[PDB]
From Swiss-Prot, chains A, B, C, D:
Binding site for NAD(+): K189, G241, S242, V243, P244, T245, E400
Pathway(s) it belongs to: Amine and polyamine biosynthesis; carnitine biosynthesis
Organism: Gadus morhua subsp. callarias (Baltic cod)
Highest taxon in the source lineage: Eukaryota
Lineage: Eukaryota, Metazoa, Chordata, Craniata, Vertebrata
Protein known as: 4-trimethylaminobutyraldehyde dehydrogenase
Residues at the active site: E263, C297
The keyword Glycosyltransferase belongs to this UniProt entry's keyword annotation: no
UniProt-listed GO biological process terms: carnitine biosynthetic process
EC number annotated for this UniProt entry: 1.2.1.47, 1.2.1.3
Subcellular location: Cytoplasm, Cytosol
Family: Belongs to the aldehyde dehydrogenase family.
Amino acid sequence: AQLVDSMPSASTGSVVVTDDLNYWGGRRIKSKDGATTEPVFEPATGRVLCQMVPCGAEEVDQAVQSAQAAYLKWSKMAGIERSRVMLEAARIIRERRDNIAKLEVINNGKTITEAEYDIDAAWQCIEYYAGLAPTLSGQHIQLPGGAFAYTRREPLGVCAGILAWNYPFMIAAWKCAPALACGNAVVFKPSPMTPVTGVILAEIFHEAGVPVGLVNVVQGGAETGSLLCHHPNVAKVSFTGSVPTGKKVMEMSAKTVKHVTLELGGKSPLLIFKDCELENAVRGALMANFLTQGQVCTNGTRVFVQREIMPQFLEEVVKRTKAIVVGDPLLTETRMGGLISKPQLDKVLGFVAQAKKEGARVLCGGEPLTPSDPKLKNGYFMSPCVLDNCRDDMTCVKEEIFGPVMSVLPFDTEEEVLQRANNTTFGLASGVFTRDISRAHRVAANLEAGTCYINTYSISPVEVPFGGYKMSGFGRENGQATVDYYSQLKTVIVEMGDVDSLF
Amino acid sequence: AQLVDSMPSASTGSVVVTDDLNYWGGRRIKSKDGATTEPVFEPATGRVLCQMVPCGAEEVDQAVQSAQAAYLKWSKMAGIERSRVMLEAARIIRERRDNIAKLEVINNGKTITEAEYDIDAAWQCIEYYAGLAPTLSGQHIQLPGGAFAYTRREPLGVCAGILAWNYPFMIAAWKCAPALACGNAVVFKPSPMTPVTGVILAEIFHEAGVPVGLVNVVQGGAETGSLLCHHPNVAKVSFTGSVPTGKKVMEMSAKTVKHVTLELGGKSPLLIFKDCELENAVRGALMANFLTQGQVCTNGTRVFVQREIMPQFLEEVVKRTKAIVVGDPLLTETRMGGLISKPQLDKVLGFVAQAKKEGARVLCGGEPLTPSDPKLKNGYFMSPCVLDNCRDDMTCVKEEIFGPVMSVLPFDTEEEVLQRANNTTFGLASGVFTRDISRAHRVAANLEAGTCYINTYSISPVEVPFGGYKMSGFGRENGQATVDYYSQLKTVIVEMGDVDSLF
Amino acid sequence: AQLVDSMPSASTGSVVVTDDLNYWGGRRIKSKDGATTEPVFEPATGRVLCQMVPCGAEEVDQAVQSAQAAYLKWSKMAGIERSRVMLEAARIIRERRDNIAKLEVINNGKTITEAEYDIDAAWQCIEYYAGLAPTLSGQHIQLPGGAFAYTRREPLGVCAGILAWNYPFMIAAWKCAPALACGNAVVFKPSPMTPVTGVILAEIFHEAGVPVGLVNVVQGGAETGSLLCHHPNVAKVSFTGSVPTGKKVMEMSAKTVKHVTLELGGKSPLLIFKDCELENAVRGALMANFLTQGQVCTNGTRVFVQREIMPQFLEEVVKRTKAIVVGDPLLTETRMGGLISKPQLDKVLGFVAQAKKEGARVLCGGEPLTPSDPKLKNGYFMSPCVLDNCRDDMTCVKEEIFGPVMSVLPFDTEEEVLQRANNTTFGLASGVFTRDISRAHRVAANLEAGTCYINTYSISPVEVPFGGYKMSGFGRENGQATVDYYSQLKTVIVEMGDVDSLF
Amino acid sequence: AQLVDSMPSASTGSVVVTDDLNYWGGRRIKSKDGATTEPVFEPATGRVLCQMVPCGAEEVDQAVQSAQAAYLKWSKMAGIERSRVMLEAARIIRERRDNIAKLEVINNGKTITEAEYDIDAAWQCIEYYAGLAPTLSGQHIQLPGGAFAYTRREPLGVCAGILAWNYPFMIAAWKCAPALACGNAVVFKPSPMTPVTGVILAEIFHEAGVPVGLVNVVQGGAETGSLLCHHPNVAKVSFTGSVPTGKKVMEMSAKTVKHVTLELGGKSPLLIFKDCELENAVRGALMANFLTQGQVCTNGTRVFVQREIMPQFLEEVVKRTKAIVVGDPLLTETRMGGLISKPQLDKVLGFVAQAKKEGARVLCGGEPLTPSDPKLKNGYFMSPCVLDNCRDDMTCVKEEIFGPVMSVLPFDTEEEVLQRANNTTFGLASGVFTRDISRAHRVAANLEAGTCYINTYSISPVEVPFGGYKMSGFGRENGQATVDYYSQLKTVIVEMGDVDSLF
């Protein structure tokens, strides 16, 4: 909190984090035990910011017990009473917006240009669900013969959220906001690579007036995450991350018959027809691939371009990718920072190398990079990459890469591209550029994914739901549908006369 | 079908079933392979009606493939076009109501008095989802700066249902109706003890005009049920059954990230306060424990009665239970038939013997029974049982028995009973009898279960949702909420001008 | 009913109607008093079919009283019980579809090709609101400090419907279907020019099982319509007709603070941009002006065509209008019958003469016509008309004509046409033909009217709402919104503890 | 605004109002023409606070034109952009809560204890509708043969509100909040007796950032109100007041086919059964009659008390009414202030005098009153009144008095009271006191009114809708239903293929 207030004089390479990062009972917990810690890095520089101390069984249980006691209070507050507190939380994140965005950049590596949008999305999501809280309700229905039923929309209990490292503060907020509005308590676990801005969110809800212990933070990796999935007093788990880990979460969660939502990755397709407006389609493909160092779940990483306009699409897209400024993320004019870790950078570079071995053409980038600026020398940098000559059987066309690597492929017909776009087990997002009104809605209808962008890419409105089809997961975040994954209906049937009985 | 038309002249002990029971591609499949078969019994008499021939991997895949091709057609019909077909199905079940009910009694063993209500519930559920079909929709939302979004409500694909044996035709229908109205295809698997009325439902949908292959039936036990859960081209599984089997379903379904709904059993509590109307409470407890030979998931099998009125409750409830007529289910004045199988009868009799070993007091029944009528001598009959002197730690108070065994227990205060009623991992249903208006709504609000009945028990309206809390499962059947578990929203974001780009 | 059954052997010029046309208490009422009657005509031939005998104060009061007693019964049936009756009504209209369509043609004059669609619309609307009936519901909301509220969705009472003559059977059904599904009773009044098919609808609901007196018919003109507006025991009036009469309805209804919905006429604009597909736009303009002899409320009677394509648009549209076969409506190849009455034909012909006096150019039609077939010689026929050289200040461009008269006008820009399309006090419908996706949605958004068709005209889905903006009326018919104009919410607040008092 | 800031040092008898009270174009308008002004009084003292200067045709037109230009801007902002501004308006009222409450007391006369609740309701209603604005939406529906439709939820235009004097600031807010959330502009007209706090609300919206001229204030009486009703560029009128004036508003509104909602008075019934908790029922009856000097539209002014408990009800209710402290409203222990005007006080006193002439028994109060404090001598004071020995045909039992006069009547049975309670043309609110669950819900269901309170009276939650049945008006305020009276659906039908044409 003092670290947050010190952000206006901070810069890349200058910060060290000294706070305790575990948080329950309304306070930061002093680490002990000498548990094996893990380093947490600054992506632009490679420096160690602090050590993360992971939670074992005892720690998770304390977190959950704290959450349960606040839940007994918060679930007795009406919609309009929870709303008021949630609106104050939003107000405080707004006031501290620029400081939070800076600290976000330092741990995660994305540009401040992007980070300011993330932090804005975080407070807008809280204000949005605050707004829905007094609206929450069940039904009243008249039954045959004078009886009537009513449904009560109730909370679940303690909800656990297991988060990813690409949008740390914003994804913490996207799981806290709907949970709280519905009258639940929350325990969440940041990715161990990005543990610090999460406890600021939890502190701000306490400042805003939440019953002590309502929002709790336990740091750690797979084991800490597994404890949450196995805990007998957690009612629901919400997970964001990879397919393989999502599958395991669902399996562990089966032991207590828990509510589960899964937001997994993708290999989303972007379809560009010959009648498009080329400059908009160029902007779309760039916005589909290169935000946040290409580490974005929805990215349209298979770009299908209709044969006739392929040459002019490629010419402009390659020039624009090479022009991306890679460097210090705290500069307003930087457009790409370092990827999140060394092992991630190496895996992404490993994919490009493997693609050239399978026959792919590198039109630009796909290599390690060292910026001019000396304090950035050990950062996790690479040049954004555009691949050509790609096939549907290639590893880079089938697998989620999660770095800045666009794969471009030609197509001839709408029927053809739609089968190649849908021939996958993934189904998070997709897009289409075209000017014909029928073609635009037809293609959106036939694409098998949770979201389809028409003549744009990467918009994330709070007003509408978001989530996967097929193996990209199930459940939604944002919009009105999401309330149904954080509340449950109890059916109450009232007999107004005497009982009808066979005995 | 010819068997169904021959029901008016049939009677207990007269029927043999000769039809093939596997059904896909719009036709009954001639068994082959010499797969090890299993006997299917008539509960009232012990006779063998036929052998069930279980499906292996090859059979399940044929069933799913037939479902997939019909799905391609049905999902292109609008709500109003699906509705018209579903309405003809419900008309055909209506017309053949009495014949279908009779055959349902012969396989399952319940009385025709109950069976007629089951079959009416089945056609009313199909008519109710038909009516919702043309109503199905997503949203249109106006977004900042001229863009707009819309959601499309879409089908899932091939849905699998795995059913239980206590309400064969009605549970088939409760999973087909919402699945079909939302535009899906279906493959279901009857319990192997009750395979025969299931394929009549599937033939009637085809008669009504469904695209060939839309509703399919595969018979078998756990292995057949596992193939469905593992099949890569099934989009959703809906299971009804025990806790332990539902856990495994959820685990197997995690391998392909499947949509899952679970309807597991219960140990539901029924709270009877001293200000109730005693006769209506007596009817309530009887209707809470003895329908369908005590083989009902919501049964209120822990009857908590306020200490002051316990003696008079017990006096009347034991006299009424002993008066229950047990015998041939095809007679209108029979009120209890045989239990479903010999092993079930034995396990149920084992619970009553075990209870008397732990201390429980048998007030009546709880023993094998041989009716006067000689054709009924090998049937699976027992006398309905009321237990007294019970404790919260007893096996019969904690475990789902699934036979006609009421456990009765005293209580002194509302705060006391509510903790003992909720101290369980089950949470299907519950009930309360009281006349004070605050007490009624307050108890119903504090009871942790999907359903609460006020001053009645065992109503099942199609108009309202039904499903578990906690370890009794998740997902709903009936009502308007259920459409959300058989359809999925796609968010389509439309950019009306030029793209906002950082690149 | 015997007349309806005799339709298969009927033909133009052969029918006489001998039934009593007043209907309440579940039966046709024998006229008396010798009230001044009025002739009812066959538009194709000019023959008198029968005399209409209008209702006075005593008659209207009897109709309302009958409606009130059936309302006491029907409002006590649950949605699922109302639904079953309404579905049987739709089934009966389906079975007698062709016979009812034929009789509809004889009195109203439109072709059987169009009448079969009208009668299908009538049963589908009754089936659609049947489907909605078991869905009807209010809310359950949790309030601060333990209180809760619920809303009950209730019926209104006796609803009156005042109908037009252009879609007699269909519009009777559009007001009866939502009123009945919501639990109300109905008294309606057909146009006195088209009184006969209305009482068939009312007899069919009684056949289907409605409590006697639920649907009633009173015949008459302005006076009979005024008695309904003034009657103290009518809860709601629904009117369809002209602006000046709708204004008066609203005013008379103000004396008893009645619920009112008004569906008034229009002067709807159709915008045809140079990038359209010309043949589809030609079809659109034709379908926007000449169904039912041009006597359609939504007709796009101001056709704005972008200057560059105006010549080719006009060439094809004039050839297609002259090709329209005008003659006996009972032939399947006829495409225009006679207009409803002689005074209506004369007024429509008066508009075309006035237009030529103001400077308009007649490109075709606009004159009296005598078909070859001799039995049609006194029918109310004219040739369908296309006008050119029109201006925004002309009488024919400003006023609703309600005959087959297309006014066609050039435009140069989108901003220009939008202001001239919206510069009216009407606001019923509108249309746009264009292929650009943004232009289509943007123009639909900026047009001030209840309905916009994109790339088509005159579709009327039951699934979606329909009604006016501005002086074209308020309230809706069809879709889900319409249930809120035939039911009302009652808010019930329940205090769960002691009262908070200042006294 | 400077007056508002000076409130902490203000007191009864000290204030004079010197501001201009007409407001449009974002600023207070200097009166001119020397139009005949009217005095505005301080109810506790009889002093003149200022003169009200009414608007003529020219002034109203200026206000509406200003509203129209702001509407062009605000209707292009999305829900999420309107929300942010509305939330800031709520924040500003919150901060100035106590000062605004005081000024409200000085003009209107009600106690600060009540006024603080009024001013809190006003900001909570603005915050509730802000929260709904980003939720606003239409539908997306798939139609037969690939077509699809969508509805846009659009604003109306310039909405006019005509307000009452009993809850001046709160009622201005209740009509501004839903109008503004839905994208409209607003022109409202305070009662001419209470003109001053309304222009503070309109200044606070401007401070919050509303497009200049969005919220306008025109002062005046019936003629100023008529000009709004007749104005050709006003889309909707919302009226609060008496039945006779409401009727005229509807009639005047018919000339331009305007949208109208009417909130008229009542003669609400409160039913107390012999099984109630007597003290809670006494509190109920007191809170149903004596808030805001008895000048409340929903008051339960016909108290029906079951014969057996009548004596004890009356004993406690009379003693409690006599104990009400009547005096300076700005003291925290005062519980009743002066009525609004001298003519109102005289008419109220006239009703009590007339009641005693018809046979009624005055059990307390009903007379002019002069408090001890000398600065209150000329205030409009009376003693709160309880009447006995009343009949259904009496003038005081049939007519809305709008002063502190409770009429108490005996009853014997539920069927009896229900008919006497419903035998009226009014139908705003009602209530019931009883402990039996079935009786509570059954009585609420059979009472013919927009609101029924169970075991309490006078709660006004923002979360649920509020408005009348029968001649107490139509339309709602508060809750989610109210959005449908301040927005309209446009149906957009999109043909995906070629046009189906008969021509």
